[PDB]
């Protein structure tokens, strides 16, 4: 502003040629000095927008994409598998049945032994054993003392013995899957583990003593050996009594064994009747000990009457046989037979004999050079 | 490259050239063997643009380019005279003595004119201008003009010689004429460079042809009084 | 009849091989190796193929040393002597036998067929005609075996294979034994044990016939005659001899079975005067052509569906006892 | 002062940085505006005066000269020849003696005139003047009054008058060379300057009055004219009386003038004797006025005796002459002559007459035709 | 005698020239100019030479205008008329006269001789014989002049020149005048004035003779008879007539002088009956040969020793009165 301010003054000085420049300056700027403005403008402007149109452009590209998608889904496991894989054979320990050569001592009072017998009556392996074998078996039973809280047998464990309770109380437990149930108790009575006498197999339950007690035990091997040995001895003995009987000489080994398999034994006290005259002849006997008296009441000798008493036709001993006619005929017994003292006979049923070997008459003829002899023996005089 | 032609702003303000004459003479009374180093009476100028004009056709082309430049310089000045104030003394490395162009808004305008001049001439096929910065100055002596000076121990301009003119206002030149000058041809009778052609910037020069008349002078009187107060 | 011919020629052929076992026959380098199906719970049985002939066989791997433990080492050294001496159409075959530091390798024949146990269990039970078909094969096999005084002792669906021709093939002679007289080992399978075995009375050929009765019953019913959850009860039932027959069982069948499942040896079929003819001539087997079944000319009612690297010891070990092999 | 004014404001704007340049201008120029004090001057007189124009261009010239210088002592040189020493002629003013035609009145009492006569007795020019001329001369003397201290005459001055003192005292001075001497005085008596009546000549002394006085003066020209005129009249008159005398008719003009030059005059009172009978005849007379009686005592007529008385022979009047015989003889007078009334005669001595003209007898004969007549007149009867 | 002849012829010659003055005779261009001795205290006399004849003359320069003042202008116009009409051997001569705007120029003869005054004063006084010699010349000159009724009136040593022949030549006719009868101007020289002049009685020829007496006395004495320091005393002595003669004066001289210096005109020589013969026949002049002196044949006793440029007015001035000249 300085140059323009002073230019207005200087224009007027040049135009007006005043004689006193300073006085002219006082007047000029004083008149300028009032500085009144006739008009002034103050303005506010709204925003203003200008519109343009933009230029075009061209873009060129081609793109191709290839992909393949697959999905899978899953399910609950059930149903579970159903099938069961296998079954199995069993086998006990082998043993030479035929007696090796004589080569178990556990004391027992009468009451104890008597009680063991009772406890064993119903066990199938014992149920039908003869007097002797049962004795040898009880002899072999060893005692086992048990203190309270002790496990006699534990489920799953291998088994070798059978036990009879002598004294004490016991709890029986059975685990099925993950559960164990105290199923029952024994109070000074009982037996268990019979299966162990057959073959080795897992114990099916656990038995724990709940007091001081005593049990009689029996080991499988000992039990099997006692029994087999005895039955194999009996067989050899039966075999001999059949073999020495001439009527059966034409029999083959295997045929004698079929007899041995089924033939019976009977004990008779002196004087008791074995065969009664008149009843039906179903079997024959072979004396293995003692003697037998054969009597006939002499009446069936004529036409009505007579003797009607007692007459001894024959008298047999160890190794002999009687009742043979039941094998070749079907008429009532001709005479009665009584035990002369203590007797033991092998008893064979005729019908069983025939089913096994066929009729006796054919056997007698097998060996033709002895057929006559045999015939005279069976239907002859003496 | 070596120029052989230049655009020249002649110094027409007699006060400037008279002041330089005084400066030159005062130096010479101190050391008269500097005689041949002094630039000749009548030769004073500002170089606006250097160039090469290497034949008759190119000399004609230069003349054409100068004519074409006129409207451009008129455009640049935007209705105001260009005033060049010459104040003080400087040297280029003690070998060239010059009156300085005073700083101000005129320097940028002058530079703009120089660059537009360079472009105008090059677009007519004339190698013109330089890569170095345009630093206008008004030369008054050059030691190279007097080779025997080295040969006898004078190898720089003693700064003491022009001490009294260090802040001397020589005067102001208003841009009007621009000359296309030969560096190598014989100088004119009046001492100035040989001139191929000239243009005049001025209208001459006013925004309005009709007289104000003399109204503007108030502007000149005020502007000059303000410059003197600074 | 030819029956006598066959058996006579049979005993001859058998006694010859029995009194002179064919030891270490073929060489291990003549057979390669394929799959290896022979695990289970005992023994190492692996499939194998032949060289020149290029046949398939089932080789049982029995480490000479592996023996000595277990339950017995004779029930095998004996088993081998029998398999080698016998020859019947419904019996598996010991093709090649050999040993040496490896020792005792059994090259059994191979039939890519199905198990009797799996078939029977799937369909539940066989029709009587179909059951009679398999039964006939077992009767004939037992007649042959007993002719040689050999008892099988382990009859059961589990030990019977159905070959690709649909006929039975008997396997596993683990309990097979030559016995003239009486024997005593308590062995077999619970369900199939004879009263005499359970009670140790001594026995021989009669147990095989009892087992047959059990086998026939199970085939026609789907379950064995003396079944029970506890082994003890099975035996008590076996000993009592009491049997209950399904409603659908025919008369002829029931009768035949009452005669096979006889606790009384004086009444058991096969053990009587006529032996195996009491069975062959039974009304239940009337529509049976025994020769036809023997020659496998009859049409079976069902055609079945169809690892590692061990080495020797470079030295023979237990060969200081397994000589006979 | 415009740029300086704008600059000074700008300098203070740059220093003070006022936000309001217009208010700052009002204050700056108001403070500046009084601006004491503009000027001092001294006013003095030029003093203004008229002057010839100040400036001319100057010519430049070169010149050379030569000189003669005379140096001498300075002297008055009052006296210089004066070589002559030669006597110079003198001359009075000329004048027509013969009376022009009658064409000086200064009053004087008897005592004054009588005193003038006395004062003039001895002056040579006056000494022998007749009664009449002396009277005419005194008549012509004019009076000159003088106041004390006045110079009557000054030595050296030209002279024209002669003076007679009437009253007063005077000092006489004479300068000889460089000296002036108060030589003598006059006390109411005296005269001086007589020479002036002859010709013009320098006054030889200076006369100064020492009191109020009076002098009678006479101018040369007046004095000479009175005298010449009168003597020339007398001459003409004498000439006539000689001319009318027949005895002298043969005389030439010049001869009559010689007589006129020397002839005398005498006055006789009535009755007095002029010529005495008996004395010697020396002269002759010519009456110019009056009458004369000639007597003779008749004794000289015989021889001793007679008359001895008085007898009148002749009686002459104006123009006549007597005593003529003295001219032609040498005898004593024949008769006496007495004046008859107042007489005036011209008297001529015979001896002088002869020395001048020779003897009278020769003159009488000059004219021969009148010789006889003349002779009879002289020696004749009447 | 020839005396009468001479005078008669003389009067004739004179009356002729007197009644017809020879005016403006010669021309100024016939005479040149030499020295210029003519100052003193009046007039301008300069020497001059002639052309054809080439003679020397003394020309008096009288400016026509210069006149009119001074003392008189007739004592000259008259002087000229006389010089021209007279002719005598002891009288200066008016050779040529002329005028015109210059006007009045006198061409007098010239004698390169000496002055009488200078000669007499130097030697003091002349011897009587020598004095008688000069005297005779003056007597003869006066007889001639008086014959023409002319009186000189200014006799004195100062007006007498001694020519180269030693004879007298009279100069200066300033007071010369023709008078028949009587005249009256008081003029001459103090020392030489006659009583009748001093007293104004009227006079004529007698004064010249008185002057001669004075002239003769002074020559023989050295001083004039009536000398005195004051003019007045001179005249009183002159009037008294008393004279005292030096001791050396001879008798004849004293007598002659008593007769010349006669105050009484009836006794003065020259004025009496015989006129100039009373003088010529005096004993003092007895040894004088009058004719000889006249013809200048006698031997004189003493032979004497022997500027600017003026112009006319180109116009005649005072010629409106100086006609007669």
Author numbering:
A (entry chain C), D (entry chain B): 9 to 111, 116 to 394
B (entry chain A): 88 to 317
C (entry chain E), E (entry chain D): 13 to 318, 332 to 350
Question: What does the report in the manuscript say about this coordinate set?
Answer:
The PKA holoenzyme is a tetramer composed of two regulatory subunits (R) and two autoinhibited catalytic subunits (PKAc). The local action of PKA is dictated by A-kinase anchoring proteins (AKAPs) that impose spatial constraint by tethering this kinase in proximity to substrates. The D/D creates a high-affinity binding groove for a canonical amphipathic helix on each AKAP that forms the reciprocal binding surface. Here we have used electron microscopy (EM) to evaluate the topological arrangement of the fully assembled type IIα PKA holoenzyme when anchored to AKAP18γ.
Class averages revealed a remarkable variety of configurations. These ranged from a tightly packed pseudo-symmetric triangular configuration to a fully extended linear configuration of the three densities. However, inspection of particles at various tilt angles showed that particles of linear and triangular conformations remained clearly distinguishable, even at high tilt angles. In both 3D reconstructions, a central mass with dimensions of 60 × 60 × 80 Å (corresponding to the site of AKAP18γ as demonstrated by affinity gold labeling, black triangle and Figure 1D, inset) was flanked on either side by larger densities of 100 × 100 × 85 Å. In the triangular conformation, the two peripheral densities are oriented at a 100° angle with respect to the central density and exhibit an end-to-end length of ∼300 Å (top). The end-to-end length increases to ∼385 Å in the extended linear configuration (bottom). Moreover, this back-projection analysis demonstrated that when the triangular model is tilted completely on its edge (where it may appear more linear in projection) its dimensions (max length = 300 Å) are significantly smaller than the maximum end-to-end length obtained for the linear reconstruction (max length = 385 Å). When AKAP18γ is docked to residues 1–43 of RIIα (RII(D/D)), the resulting sub-structure fits within the central density of maps for both the triangular and extended configurations (yellow). In a similar manner, the peripheral densities each accommodate a PKA sub-structure consisting of one catalytic subunit (blue) in complex with the cAMP-binding domain of RIIα, residues 91–392 (green). Finally these models were completed by connecting the central AKAP18γ–RII(D/D) sub-complex to each RIIα-PKAc unit through a flexible chain corresponding to residues 44–90 of RIIα (‘Materials and methods’).
